[PDB]
Design a protein around this ligand. Structure first.
Ligand SMILES: [K+]
Ligand SMILES: [K+]
Ligand SMILES: [Mg+2]
Ligand SMILES: [Mg+2]
Ligand SMILES: [Mg+2]
Lengths: 140, 126, 119, 252
RNA sequence: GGUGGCAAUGGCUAACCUUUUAUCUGGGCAGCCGAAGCGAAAGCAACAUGUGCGCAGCCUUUUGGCGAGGCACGACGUAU
RNA sequence: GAGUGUGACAGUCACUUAGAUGUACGCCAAAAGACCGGAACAUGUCCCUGAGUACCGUGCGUUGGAUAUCGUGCGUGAAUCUGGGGGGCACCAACCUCCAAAACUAAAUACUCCUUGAGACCGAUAGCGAAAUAGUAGGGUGACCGAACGCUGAAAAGUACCCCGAGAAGGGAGGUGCAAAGUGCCUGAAACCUGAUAGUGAUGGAACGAUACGGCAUGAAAGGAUCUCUGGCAUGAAGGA
RNA sequence: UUAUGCUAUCAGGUGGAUGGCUCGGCUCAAGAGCUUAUGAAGGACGUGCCAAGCUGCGAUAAGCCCGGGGUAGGUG
C-alpha cells in the first residue's frame, strides 16, 4: 500500500487496530474453510469439493492444431507468396503439414479453388472446399 | 475543458495525444464542428479502451470512397476490397499495406483535420 | 602508489594510511627546480635530509633552507628556518609537507642517489 | 532529410542523406522508460547481513516486573532483537534478493532510441537540454575525424565546429556535490557535453575520451542513456559519415 | 487500474551467446499467452453479418435519414 | 579531466591515472624426436559374456509415483545368444528397444576462510557484537550470554614568568593560536541545574490555552511609510432610528 | 528589596543531541582454494631498557640468516 499516505493515520486503513493480526483475520490460511465458513467463497472462486471424470495419459491423448477454411481461403495468397503454398493452373495447393495444422475445420467461406492436403477434415470443411471447386487430400 | 478534462489530459504521456486533444478542441470551437470535440473526448478516455479496429470491420461497413476516422489503431486482420480513406491514430504494418494496395489512404487525425475542418461526411469507427 | 583499480576514497586512504615504509619513501617527493628537472630528466624527487629546498606554500613561502630531518611515518620534513616559537620562547621546528616545497640543490653524498631519483 | 558534412576545419564539404532513424517523432515518455530501465538494470544488490540484530537468545520477562514485554538478554535487562530495541534488527530492510531490473520490450526500446537520435537534430531540444553550441544540427563530420589520435586534434575540430564551448562548460561546471556521495566515491557532479558517434572502433575513441563531459562511442554501443542523459533528450552529438551510413536500419 | 510498444501476416522472449568487466548493442522461436469450442472420455467441431432497435457523429427540409461501437434476435458447434 | 593526499575547492604540488616496462621460483606451452599399437571382411551341432544376483511374495519407510517411485527387513529365487531385461496392473501375442547384477572418467556446477573490484547500501543508539588494548570488560558451576567507548590544532605553537593556595590540585593575571579548539579537547541541542533580566506576586481557584480589550516591558536586522494615529468630505449593501 | 514562588528570554553549568568528517561495516561480482606426525589450527606461559593490554615472536623470543626490490632513515 501507499505507506506515505498513511503516515499519521495510526491504523493505516485497517479499521480497528485490533484488525490485521494474523490468519484469524482472514479466516485461516490459504483456501481453508471451504466446507465450513468459506463455502460460498469456495463456490464463487471455483474451489468447491468434489472430483469429476478421469484423465487419459498424455502419451496416448493428443490435441490437433486446427485452421478453418475461411482462414485458409482468405489468406491463401499470403501463403503462396510466403512459400507455404503454390498455384497450379489456378488452384491453390496448400499442405497443412508444413503449417503445423492437422485438422481443417469448416468455419468461414471458401471463394477459390483450394486443393488442401491435411491429416483430417471436418465434414463441413469437406463440403465447403469441394463446392468451391477444390478438393481435400488425406495424408497417408 | 474543466478539471475532469484536465485530469485526463495531464494523465497522458504521449505528446502527440496531448497536442491532438488540444487542437481538436480548438477546431471544434473554431470550425463549429462537434466531430472534433467528440474525437477529443474519445482520446481523453482511458487508453485501455482505445479503438483497435481490424480491416474486416471497415470492409464490412463501408462503401467506395468512404471516409473513416478511427480514434485508435487500425489492425490488419481481414481483407479490404474497396478503396477507403482512413484517418487513424496509428496503423499496423499489415493494415497500412492492405489499405494502400486496396487503393485507400492511410492518413492521420491531424491530416484529416487539415483536409476538411468541418468534418462533413466523416464517419467515426470504433 | 595507488592504481585506478580503486577509485574509492576509502581504499585510497587505507592504502596511504597502511602504506609500508618503502612506499612511504615515495610520499616524500617534491618538485625539482627547473635546472634540476632539466639535468635529471624527471619532474620530482624524494626530499632527503640535507638537500636545499624553497618553501612555496604556507606561512614560510620563499624561505630557502636545508632539510634538517625527515619522518616517513608522519610524511613531514623539517627545514632550517621554518620554526614555531613556543611559549617558553625557545625555537621549535614546524614540520612541513614535502609537496609544499621545491628542491633547489640535491645532496649527492650517496652514490646510489642518482638511480634512486630515476630508474 | 539531408545534412551537410563539415571537414576538420569546419567547412561543409558535401552532403549526406539522413537515415529514417532521424525523422522519428519526439517521445519523451518512451525515452524516460528506456533510460530508467537501463539505470535500474545497472543497479547492485545490497542489504544488511542475515541475522543482524537477531543473533541473541533474548527472551521476554513477562508480566509481574513492571517492565515492557520486549525480549531481554538472559543475564540482563537490556532489550534485544526487536526493531524498536537498540541494536535490534531492521524491520523491512533492503534485501540482496530484491530484483531491481526493469524490462522494456526491444521494439519500444528501439523506438525510444530512434526518438532520442532524432532529438539530436532539433536545436530547440539541444539548447533547452543545457548545451552551448553555435553549429547547425545535426552535425555530420567527414570520416577523417575518426583517424585523429590526439586530444589537441579533437580540440581543433570542436573549435572549428563551434562545439568546444560546451566542453568548456562541462569542465568548469564540474562541481563537488553535496552529501554522502563524496565519501562513497561520487565526489563530483559531472556535466555532459558532446557525444561523438563513430562508424567502428577507431583512434578517435581514445583521442576524444578525456575531454570533459564528452562521450565517444560507436553505433553498436549506442543506447538511450547516452542520447538522453537523465532521461532528457537533446544531446549535442557529432556523427561521422560512417556512423550515418551504419545507422540505416540500426533500430528499425 | 493509469500510461505505453507491437498486433492475427499476433505478442514477448527464457536460459544462453555477444560485455571490450554486471549497464549496454545485436542475437537467441525453446517455450508461454492469444488464435475454437463443447465433452468425464472417445470424439466431433461453429456467423469475415440474416434481421431489428438505436447512442455518438455526419447529413437534414429540424423532422427525419445513414448509423461504427452498444443492445435484442436469428442461425450455427458441441454435451446432455 | 579515475581518484586520494597536501594548512579551503588541484588534470599541471605529491602519490597516481592513461600507457608502457621488468621480474627469481614456478605454471601452461607450440615445432621436432622415443615408445605399447590400429581397422575391415569370410566361415560356425564351436567357446565366453558378472547369482543368493535379476525377478517374485510379504512388512515397513520414502516418493508425484497412482494395482504403475525408490530403498531395505524377512522369505523365495532364475536363464545363458535357440539367451536375458524394458515398453507406468498382471498375463498372452505382435512390434520397438536395450544387455544389468564389476570399474574409472575432464568440462560445464556449488560455496566463500581468503584476494581484488564495485556500490541509488550504513554513517558511530547506524553499519558486523566489535570504526576492534572486542567475543574484550562483565555475567553464568556449565552448556553459554555479552557491552560501552570515534574527532584539539595548519603546526604542540600542549600556556613561559608572576600572585594566591598545604599543594605536582585549583584559581587569578599573563601568554600561544585565524579561532581556546586547553588534552574523553570540532560543532555543542534539550531535559536538568545556577544566576540575571522583564512582567507579576503573601485576599487567592485549577487543562496552564483560544478570542477581544487594556497595563508594564520590548519593538537593531529581517515587517509597514497615504504605513500608524486622529479627523473631514463623497458613495454606501443588509439594516435603520 | 514581596519572601517562598509563577511565566518568558538571556548568561553559565551539566549533558552529549545535531551537523560535518570517517583507516570500519554490509552486500554483490570476479578470482583463488586445502592443510597437519618434517607435529597443524588452537591454547598456556614467556619475550621489550623504562612495557600493563593488544599485536608479533619462542629461551636465537616486537626477533636471526641468505637472495632480490627499495634507499635514507628505522626502532608495531
Ligand atoms: K602541497
Ligand atoms: K582536495
Ligand atoms: Mg589524474
Ligand atoms: Mg555499534
Ligand atoms: Mg552493528
Amino acid at each position: 500500500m501507499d505507506t506515505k499516505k498513511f503516515r499519521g493515520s495510526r491504523t493505516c486503513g485497517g479499521g480497528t487496530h485490533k484488525n490485521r493480526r494474523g490468519a484469524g483475520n482472514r479466516g485461516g490460511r490459504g483456501k481453508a474453510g471451504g466446507c465450513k465458513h468459506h463455502f460460498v467463497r469456495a463456490m464463487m472462486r471455483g474451489y468447491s469439493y468434489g472430483k469429476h471424470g478421469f484423465k487419459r495419459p498424455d502419451e496416448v491423448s493428443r490435441d490437433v492444431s486446427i485452421v478453418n477454411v475461411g482462414e485458409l481461403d482468405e489468406l491463401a495468397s499470403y501463403l503462396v507468396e510466403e512459400g507455404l503454398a503454390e498455384v497450379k493452373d489456378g488452384a491453390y495447393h496448400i499442405n497443412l503439414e508444413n503449417l503445423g495444422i492437422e485438422k481443417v475445420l469448416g468455419s468461414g467461406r471458401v471463394t477459390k479453388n483450394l486443393v488442401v492436403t491435411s491429416e483430417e477434415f471436418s465434414a463441413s470443411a469437406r463440403e465447403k472446399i469441394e463446392n468451391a471447386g477444390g478438393s481435400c487430400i488425406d495424408a497417408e | 475543458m474543466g478539471k475532469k478534462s484536465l485530469v485526463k489530459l495531464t494523465r497522458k504521456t504521449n505528446p502527440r495525444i496531448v497536442s491532438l486533444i488540444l487542437t481538436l478542441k480548438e477546431r471544434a470551437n473554431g470550425d463549429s464542428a462537434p466531430i472534433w470535440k467528440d474525437i477529443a473526448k474519445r482520446l481523453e478516455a482511458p487508453s485501455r479502451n482505445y479503438a483497435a479496429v481490424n480491416i474486416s470491420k471497415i470492409n464490412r461497413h463501408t462503401a467506395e470512397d468512404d471516409v473513416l476516422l478511427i480514434p485508435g489503431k487500425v489492425l490488419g486482420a481481414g481483407l479490404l476490397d474497396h478503396p477507403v480513406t482512413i484517418a487513424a491514430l496509428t496503423f499496423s504494418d499489415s493494415a497500412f499495406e492492405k489499405i494502400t494496395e486496396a487503393g485507400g489512404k492511410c492518413l492521420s487525425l491531424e491530416e484529416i483535420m487539415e483536409a476538411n475542418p468541418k468534418g462533413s461526411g466523416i464517419r467515426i469507427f470504433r | 602508489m595507488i592504481a585506478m583499480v580503486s577509485k574509492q576514497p576509502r581504499k585510497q586512504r587505507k592504502a596511504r594510511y597502511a602504506a609500508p615504509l618503502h612506499i612511504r619513501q615515495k610520499f616524500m617527493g617534491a618538485r625539482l627546480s627547473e635546472a634540476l628537472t632539466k639535468e635529471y630528466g624527471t619532474r620530482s624527487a624524494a626530499v632527503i635530509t640535507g638537500d636545499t629546498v624553497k618553501v612555496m606554500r604556507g606561512d614560510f613561502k620563499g624561505t630557502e633552507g636545508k632539510v634538517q630531518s625527515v619522518s616517513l611515518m608522519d610524511g613531514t620534513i623539517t627545514v632550517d628556518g621554518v620554526i614555531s616559537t613556543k611559549v617558553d620562547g625557545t625555537e621549535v621546528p614546524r614540520p612541513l609537507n614535502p609537496s609544499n616545497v621545491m628542491i633547489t640543490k640535491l645532496e649527492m653524498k650517496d652514490g646510489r642517489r642518482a638511480s634512486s631519483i630515476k630508474k | 532529410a539531408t545534412a551537410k558534412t563539415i571537414d576538420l576545419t569546419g567547412k561543409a564539404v558535401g552532403e549526406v542523406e539522413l537515415p529514417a532513424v532521424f525523422d522519428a517523432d519526439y517521445r519523451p515518455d518512451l525515452i524516460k522508460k528506456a533510460v530508467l530501465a537501463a539505470q535500474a538494470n545497472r543497479l547492485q544488490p545490497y542489504g544488511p547481513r542475515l541475522y543482524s540484530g537477531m543473533e541473541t537468545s533474548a527472551r521476554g520477562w513477562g508480566s509481574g516486573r513492571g517492565v515492557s514485554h520486549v525480549p531481554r538478554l538472559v543475564n540482563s535487562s537490556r532489550a534485544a532483537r526487536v526493531p524498536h530495541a537498540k541494536g535490534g534488527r531492521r524491520a523491512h530492510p533492503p534485501k540482496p534478493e530484491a530484483d531491481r531490473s526493469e524490462k522494456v520490450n526491444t521494439k519500444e526500446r528501439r523506438y525510444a532510441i530512434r526518438s532520442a537520435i532524432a532529438a539530436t537534430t532539433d536545436p530547440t531540444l539541444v539548447s533547452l537540454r543545457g548545451h552551448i553550441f553555435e553549429a547547425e544540427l545535426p552535425i555530420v563530420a567527414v570520416n577523417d575525424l575518426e583517424s585523429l589520435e590526439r586530444t589537441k586534434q579533437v580540440i581543433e575540430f570542436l573549435e572549428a565546429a563551434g562545439l568546444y564551448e560546451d566542453v568548456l562548460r562541462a569542465k568548469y561546471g564540474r562541481h563537488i556535490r553535496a552529501g554522502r556521495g563524496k565519501l562513497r566515491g561520487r565526489k563530483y557532479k559531472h556535466k555532459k557535453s558532446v557525444l561523438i558517434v563513430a562508424g567502428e572502433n577507431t583512434p578517435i575513441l581514445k583521442a576524444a575520451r578525456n575531454l570533459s563531459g564528452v562521450d565517444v562511442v560507436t553505433v553498436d554501443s549506442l543506447n538511450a542513456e547516452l542520447l538522453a542523459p537523465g532521461t532528457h533528450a537533446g544531446r549535442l552529438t557529432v556523427w561521422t559519415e560512417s556512423a550515418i551510413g551504419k545507422l540505416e536500419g540500426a533500430f528499425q
